[PDB]
A paper describes a structure:
Therefore, we generated a Uba4C202K mutation to convert the labile thioester intermediate into a non‐hydrolysable iso‐peptide bond between the activated C‐terminus of Urm1 and the ε‐amino group of the introduced lysine. Indeed, we found that Uba4C202K forms a covalent bond with Urm1 in the presence of ATP, while other Uba4 mutants (C202S, C397S, 306GGS314) led to the formation of non‐covalent Uba4–Urm1 complexes similar to wild‐type Uba4. The covalently linked Uba4C202K–Urm1 complex formed well‐diffracting crystals resulting in a structure at 3.15 Å resolution, and its atomic model was refined to R/Rfree values of 21.1%/26.2%. The structure revealed two Urm1 molecules with slightly higher B‐factors bound to a dimer of the Uba4 AD, while no specific density could be attributed to the RHD, which although present in our crystals, appears to be mobile at this specific reaction step. In contrast to Uba4 alone, the Uba4–Urm1 dimer is fully symmetric and the AD interface falls on a twofold crystallographic axis. Interestingly, the C‐terminal GG‐motif of Urm1 is positioned in the same groove that was occupied by the linker region in the unbound Uba4 structure. Importantly, a helical region localized adjacent to the ATP‐binding site (aa 72–88) in the structure of apo Uba4 becomes disordered and flexible in the structure of the Uba4–Urm1 complex. In contrast, the loop containing Cys202, known as “crossover loop” in other E1 enzymes, becomes structured in the Uba4–Urm1 complex and an electron density can be clearly assigned to the covalent peptide bond between the introduced Lys202 and the C‐terminal glycine (Gly111) of Urm1. Therefore, the Uba4C202K‐Urm1 structure represents a unique previously uncharacterized reaction step, mimicking the thioester formation after the release of AMP that can serve as a model for this reaction intermediate in all other E1‐UBL and SCP systems.
In eukaryotes, the ubiquitin‐related modifier 1 (Urm1) pathway is responsible for the synthesis of 2‐thiolated wobble uridine (U34). Uba4 is a two‐domain protein containing an adenylation domain (AD) and a rhodanese‐like domain (RHD), which are both essential for the dual function of Uba4 in sulfur transfer and ubiquitin‐like conjugation (Furukawa et al, 2000; Huang et al, 2008; Schmitz et al, 2008; Leidel et al, 2009; Noma et al, 2009). Uba4 activates the C‐terminus of Urm1 via an ATP‐dependent adenylation step, receives mobilized sulfur from the Nfs1/Tum1‐relay system by its RHD, and subsequently forms thiocarboxylated Urm1 (Urm1‐COSH; Leidel et al, 2009; Noma et al, 2009). We heterologously expressed and purified Uba4 from Chaetomium thermophilum (CtUba4), a thermophilic fungus harboring highly stable proteins, well‐suited for X‐ray crystallography and other in vitro approaches (Bock et al, 2014).
Residue numbers in the entry:
A (entry chain DDD), B (entry chain DDD): 4 to 71, 87 to 236, 238 to 304
C (entry chain GGG), D (entry chain GGG): 11 to 62, 64 to 111
Amino acid sequence: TQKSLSKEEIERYSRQMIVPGMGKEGQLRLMNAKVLIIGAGGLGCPAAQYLAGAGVGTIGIVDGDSVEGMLKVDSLITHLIEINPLPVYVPYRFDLTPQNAAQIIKPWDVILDCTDNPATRYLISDVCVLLGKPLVSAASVQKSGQLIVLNCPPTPQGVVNKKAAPCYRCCFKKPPPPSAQTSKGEAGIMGPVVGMMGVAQAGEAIKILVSQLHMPPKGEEVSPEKNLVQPTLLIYTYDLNSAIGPYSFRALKMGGRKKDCFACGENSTLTLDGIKSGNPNYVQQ
Amino acid sequence: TQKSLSKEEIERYSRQMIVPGMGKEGQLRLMNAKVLIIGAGGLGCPAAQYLAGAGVGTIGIVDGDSVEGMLKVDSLITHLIEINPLPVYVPYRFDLTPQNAAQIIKPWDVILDCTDNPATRYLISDVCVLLGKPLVSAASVQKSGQLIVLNCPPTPQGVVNKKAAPCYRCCFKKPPPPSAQTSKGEAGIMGPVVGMMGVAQAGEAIKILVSQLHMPPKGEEVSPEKNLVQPTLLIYTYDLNSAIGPYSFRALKMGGRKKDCFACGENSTLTLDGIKSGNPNYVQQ
Amino acid sequence: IPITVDFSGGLEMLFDNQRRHSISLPAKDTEGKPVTIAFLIDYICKKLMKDPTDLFVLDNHIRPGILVLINDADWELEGEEAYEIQPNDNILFVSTLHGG
Amino acid sequence: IPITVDFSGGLEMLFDNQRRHSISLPAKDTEGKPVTIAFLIDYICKKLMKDPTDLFVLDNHIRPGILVLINDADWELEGEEAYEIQPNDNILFVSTLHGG
Ligand SMILES: [Zn+2]
Ligand SMILES: [Zn+2]
């Protein structure tokens, strides 16, 4: 709702206010924006740091885990105020589940996924899809990382009749593999990988808000130079036995909603009521 | 010199200790390592953050500038202890010049460049070359950023007879353009760009140390799968009107030492004594 | 047919830290009809592998985990495991990442 | 000769936020001999430009600032401003970044 800029705010944001695309007009977008981050460790931290810094209006965070007593949500928020006092930080000081995930998302304009568990990753997309929200998902384990921008702009469930942004299921159809799953606790993590990926995640979120890419298009089709409906899956491999290689960042363009997707496709048996009840039980393991 | 790992250290580093390439062996490399960052604003912060976190032995920082009273060096170091108490942080609480730059580098194993001024950027390479040190240079203005790994492994000045890593002059031969120069203060900066670039810079530095790539090779040639002697110049353009695009990360392989380079090439009239005196006066503007 | 094969996403670990793989194939399969990508999976897993099978292919089919791309194009629309390989094609095997 | 031309490194700002540029060229220059890259600079700066000249080319030559790459290959070894352009070549104009 805020229409004008504080001398306080004008001073803080002037460095990125004077860039093509980001006027008093472009900045107010971010200040009224409401972004949510699911997961506070690893990708959460840098993602949150670069939203905070950018002056995203409200920044949510969801993690019931503690540090290695004190929840990691709290630790991080305490950190973020130092970067930017002005944003409203909103800690969900527990872990997301089917019972709540519906409740935890309906408020927020853009969803970031840093969840680190495959079951949860599927859950979010489902909900995000149903509620009609854009997902910037991102993953990192060991020496490798990857990122993608799903359901932007958010096309209603089952509307296959129009060129329409792919869901996480549409992409990554049925896998997760049961015994091929490594965790960040299991397999470790190099710092710059999770860092690159988080920072980029924030990058995509900011973009979505500032250029208003979650806004459905004018019977007109959506420009393909946005890479929204046909979005790249950027794969970062970190080779600590080599310098930056031509095959360091490979960009795999992806298909629009799979007409037969379980969730966002034609004849989906997926209901918000469903997930709550335990309907698509996330026993895929 | 340290041969063994504290329970303190073993606890902190276990997450990246269990990754291919990074044993008790690979980690001790970083702990005895001495890295220097020239420039504390913008690219300095994230670069320093991901070295600190990684447990780089000693981390130097050089910036005479204050915040927007209190020097930005001090501000940042204060920040870094929070991330990792164990490293020795070393603030050069002034600005680098020809008179000192020689003095400020001779100690350090790896040099990071975040300097933001073209004259300075050339100065460092010159010195770095002469003293025989590897440079991870990186730059960012407005919506675009780029990074490269020069003089790794460090090949002595004038040794053109062997396949040899390119200097900053060898690359970017005579330009900087006098009136085409925009500063970060002049043209602004989006957050995720400088962030990506800094984090990557740390990335390259860590790699150099952990895999020991500053170490000259066995009469044997240097593997080209390191991309050291023929190193990529990664260019990141941030389009806030689009999602991650295939042309988001473009990787421009670069030429080994230009035999006729002013500085690191055959028949160079460049002396450490020279720069001190004001010899190649950095009036190129 | 000489082609380049790549790995990424914590798969190449299986193939001894190697991502880029160039090996020429026989133009014809075992039963004389042209090489399919059912072939490459079998050839690779049996010969090119440097590790224990469970992680790449199980029950005579690739693990649901991995994506396959032909010239950076979805494998599913272009042939989906029964694809006549081309004289200079690029095939990419990336294990979908579910950690963060 | 139809080729794709690209900008990056805070240059494309000059060409109205556009990076990718496809325009077919005459195979022969003004004096009848084959198109050189002295040509592309002249054609682009005069017609394709959307801004005031100082920033791209001055004194009948590109600003020292910029690098030119032909199929992601150094321009200097391959012809250096007097290069017979090829039927599907890619030429990249990137302004070297000296800020941070
Ligand atoms: Zn779907
Ligand atoms: Zn040189």
